[PDB]
Amino acid sequence: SPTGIVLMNMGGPSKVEETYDFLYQLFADNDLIPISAKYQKTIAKYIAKFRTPKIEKQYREIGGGSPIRKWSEYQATEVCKILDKTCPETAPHKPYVAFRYAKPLTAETYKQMLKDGVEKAVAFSQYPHFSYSTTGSSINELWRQIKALDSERSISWSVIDRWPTNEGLIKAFSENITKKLQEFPQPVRDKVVLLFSACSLPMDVVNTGDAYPAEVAATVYNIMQKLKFKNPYRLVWQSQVGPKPWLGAQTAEIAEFLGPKVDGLMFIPIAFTSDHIETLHEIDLGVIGESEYKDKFKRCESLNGNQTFIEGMADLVKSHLQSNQLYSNQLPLDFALGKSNDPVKDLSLVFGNHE
Amino acid sequence: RSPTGIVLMNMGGPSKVEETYDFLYQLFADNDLIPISAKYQKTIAKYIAKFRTPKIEKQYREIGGGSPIRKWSEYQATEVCKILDKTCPETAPHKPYVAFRYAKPLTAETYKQMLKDGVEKAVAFSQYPHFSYSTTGSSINELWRQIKALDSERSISWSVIDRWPTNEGLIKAFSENITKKLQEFPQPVRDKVVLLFSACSLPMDVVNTGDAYPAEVAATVYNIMQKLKFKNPYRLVWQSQVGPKPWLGAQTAEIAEFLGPKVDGLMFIPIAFTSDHIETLHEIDLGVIGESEYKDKFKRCESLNGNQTFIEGMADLVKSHLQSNQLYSNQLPLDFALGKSNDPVKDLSLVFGNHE
Numbered sequence: 001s002p003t004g005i006v007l008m009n010m011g012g013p014s015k016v017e018e019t020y021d022f023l024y025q026l027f028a029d030n031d032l033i034p035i036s037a038k039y040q041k042t043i044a045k046y047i048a049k050f051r052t053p054k055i056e057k058q059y060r061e062i063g064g065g066s067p068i069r070k071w072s073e074y075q076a077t078e079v080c081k082i083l084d085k086t087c088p089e090t091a092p093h094k095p096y097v098a099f100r101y102a103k104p105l106t107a108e109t110y111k112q113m114l115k116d117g118v119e120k121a122v123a124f125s126q127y128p129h130f131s132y133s134t135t136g137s138s139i140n141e142l143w144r145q146i147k148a149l150d151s152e153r154s155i156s157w158s159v160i161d162r163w164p165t166n167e168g169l170i171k172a173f174s175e176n177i178t179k180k181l182q183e184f185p186q187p188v189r190d191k192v193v194l195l196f197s198a199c200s201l202p203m204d205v206v207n208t209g210d211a212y213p214a215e216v217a218a219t220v221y222n223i224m225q226k227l228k229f230k231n232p233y234r235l236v237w238q239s240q241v242g243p244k245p246w247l248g249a250q251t252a253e254i255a256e257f258l259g260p261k262v263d264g265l266m267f268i269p270i271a272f273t274s275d276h277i278e279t280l281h282e283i284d285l286g287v288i289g290e291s292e293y294k295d296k297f298k299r300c301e302s303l304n305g306n307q308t309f310i311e312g313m314a315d316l317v318k319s320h321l322q323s324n325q326l327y328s329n330q331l332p333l334d335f336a337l338g339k340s341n342d343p344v345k346d347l348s349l350v351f352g353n354h355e
Numbered sequence: 356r357s358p359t360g361i362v363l364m365n366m367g368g369p370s371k372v373e374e375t376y377d378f379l380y381q382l383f384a385d386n387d388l389i390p391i392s393a394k395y396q397k398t399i400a401k402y403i404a405k406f407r408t409p410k411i412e413k414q415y416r417e418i419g420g421g422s423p424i425r426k427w428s429e430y431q432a433t434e435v436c437k438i439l440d441k442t443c444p445e446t447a448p449h450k451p452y453v454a455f456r457y458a459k460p461l462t463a464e465t466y467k468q469m470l471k472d473g474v475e476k477a478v479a480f481s482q483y484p485h486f487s488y489s490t491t492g493s494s495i496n497e498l499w500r501q502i503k504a505l506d507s508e509r510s511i512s513w514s515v516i517d518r519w520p521t522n523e524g525l526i527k528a529f530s531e532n533i534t535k536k537l538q539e540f541p542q543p544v545r546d547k548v549v550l551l552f553s554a555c556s557l558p559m560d561v562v563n564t565g566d567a568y569p570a571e572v573a574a575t576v577y578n579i580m581q582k583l584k585f586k587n588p589y590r591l592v593w594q595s596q597v598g599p600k601p602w603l604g605a606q607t608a609e610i611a612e613f614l615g616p617k618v619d620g621l622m623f624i625p626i627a628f629t630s631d632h633i634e635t636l637h638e639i640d641l642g643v644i645g646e647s648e649y650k651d652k653f654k655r656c657e658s659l660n661g662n663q664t665f666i667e668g669m670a671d672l673v674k675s676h677l678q679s680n681q682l683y684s685n686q687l688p689l690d691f692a693l694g695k696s697n698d699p700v701k702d703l704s705l706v707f708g709n710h711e
């Protein structure tokens with residue numbers, strides 16, 4: 001009886017070649033992308049090819065790959081290597097990764113787990129901050145992928161659906177921020193403004209009651225507490241695209257408006273745990289590199305393989321499994337408020353034993 | 356001994372219905388709050404306040420004859436100053452003042468009282484635990500103007516407590532009231548009651564300036580939910596939205612009606628102010644709750660008001676501020692860099708500190 005530890009997120013293409021199919025999946029989405037009716041399938045192809053050149057340039061501009069997959073797997077591995085030493089009752093812990101839109105997709109990793117012999121599996125959403133658009137979709141696909149590949153409930157699932165202030169996280173973001181603050185002249189240090197940048201969200205998700213904005217803010221404040229508020233800081237938002245209004249102080253505009261007003265400025269990837277397109281591209285090449293004030297624009301190191309961070313992830317799964325609950329008590333609220341053309345309508349059915 | 360001045364500050368409300376017109380004119384004249392026109396803001400304010408005064412006036416008669424803000428402010432100042440007198444003998448006697456941005460006594464009024472009383476050291480104590488430029492930033496700008504206008508000698512040395520989202524007593528007091536209000540729900544349904552932390556909302560173009568408010572409210576929310584051990588589901592929501600512009604949501608009213616038939620109970624927690632006011636006694640008590648069909652599984656958490664744990668926590672907040680010689684937090688220069696104002700402070704180190 002081995003235990004599946006499944007790191008989940010929306011993923012990125014490990015290689016430039018995987019960009020079309022990645023995009024197709026995203027635009028084929030039920031929930032998020034505006035549904036014609038049945039016709040995502042069709043029209044999603046008609047936009048993936050349209051947008052595949054531009055996003056391909058980008059991934060090539062950072063080394064021809066999204067680092068999400070390697071970093072997901074690597075994390076999932078050291079987690080289980082501590083897990084198998086820390087929770088014997090649960091061992092063996094077999095690491096897995098399953099992305100909502102990149103490879104390996106949810107179906108592709110479910111069948112691997114089924115041939116592999118896992119009996120209970122932990123859907124460990126790699127987002128410390130639940131949003132229905134992220135950790136909701138990843139769950140709602142898992143349900144579809146449970147009714148298909150497993151209509152007689154061989155694998156018993158739970159889900160770590162958020163962890164905004166796990167202390168390995170909070171602590172790893174400090175130290176990192178402090179050590180990235182030491183790259184600054186030193187008479188400036190304490191006046192560098194820590195700009196915490198989270199991927200944004202349409203206002204129409206925000207206005208449903210989504211948990212994501214406040215849960216990000218909880219992580220920021222906890223960091224600044226351990227930093228004893230040495231520095232100024234603001235939580236701002238990046239990655240706005242499309243025509244509808246999105247959330248709150250666009251990261252790029254704030255840095256411009258501040259550039260000629262500040263001795264310096266640090267960017268913090270507050271809402272993801274490894275480098276990906278948002279860090280290596282949008283900030284490094286896009287917000288920092290295309291800027292006059294680039295010499296005072298520095299970015300804090302992403303979490304990735306941070307020893308302190310991975311151990312904090314370890315104790316999180318450790319304490320999730322040993323306290324034997326299937327999901328946080330926010331999750332029924334999350335799904336009652338979220339909007340989706342095909343939703344989990346009972347998380348009791350989805351997680352736990354049902355053979 | 357000379358007294359050191361402890362000045363609770365917030366927008367205020369009209370103590371009596373006859374102050375409604377003055378209060379509304381003050382509010383609609385404040386271009387930091389509702390930007391209409393560089394030049395004619397104060398004539399236009401005159402009109403709007405003539406127009407909307409009888410509607411607001413009836414609303415206050417419906418909750419009992421006026422805003423209890425002033426009463427609770429002055430009561431908190433007094434109870435806090437009397438803790439400081441035992442706590443901070445070095446700056447005793449502590450003399451309590453209140454100064455409201457639009458109500459009476461206004462900040463000009465309260466300043467003049469302070470000069471006359473001989474105060475030489477004063478703390479602008481913003482009663483908002485969550486800084487917003489349109490409340491605390493605007494209030495700081497008002498104080499600068501009264502600095503120049505009434506006190507060019509710089510008789511008064513000012514500091515400001517410009518925020519305090521996770522003061523311990525405030526967290527605790529909220530947790531005690533939430534737990535206490537939850538006793539009024541049966542028990543098999545208690546852990547299912549949804550705690551809706553309801554904060555007054557922001558126009559999105561204010562949010563989009565990088566205003567500090569929404570994220571700081573969320574810090575209080577999460578800290579409270581930590582003290583409660585996440586026993587209940589909770590969401591942070593926003594009320595008091597008006598009119599055409601997109602505001603921050605979700606909206607308290609529409610979230611409660613959507614959730615109504617799906618929930619065992621809703622609790623509304625007045626997370627962003629410290630006493631009863633129109634928001635709680637009218638908009639929540641009478642509107643979202645009084646007029647709902649699920650109104651018997653709807654309850655509001657008691658405001659902090661005179662809560663001792665909250666008052667003791669405010670006392671420590673001031674005591675810690677005095678014994679620190681911080682004129683203001685490390686956030687304030689950033690607040691002012693991003694805030695939008697036609698008459699901003701510009702140079703907070705001239706505003707606060709000795710310049711006698």
Ligand SMILES: C[C@H](CCC(=O)O)[C@H]1CC[C@H]2[C@@H]3[C@H](O)C[C@@H]4C[C@H](O)CC[C@]4(C)[C@H]3C[C@H](O)[C@]12C
Nearest residue numbers: 391392393394395396397398399400401402403
């Ligand atoms: C005359 C002045 C514009 C002069 C100018 O700068 O060109 C205009 C600008 C906005 C106007 C005001 C606003 O429209 C609000 C009020 C509207 C009422 O019709 C009369 C008084 C009232 C207060 C107006 C008086 C006058 O029409 C104002 C004051």
Ligand SMILES: C[C@H](CCC(=O)O)[C@H]1CC[C@H]2[C@@H]3[C@H](O)C[C@@H]4C[C@H](O)CC[C@]4(C)[C@H]3C[C@H](O)[C@]12C
Nearest residue numbers: 366379382388407410411555595596597633634
């Ligand atoms: C008086 C005016 C319109 C009243 C009416 O509909 O008749 C209303 C519309 C928006 C209101 C404001 C916003 O709702 C937000 C703030 C909420 C605070 O509780 C009081 C001041 C506060 C700044 C409000 C004061 C005032 O009553 C306003 C300005």
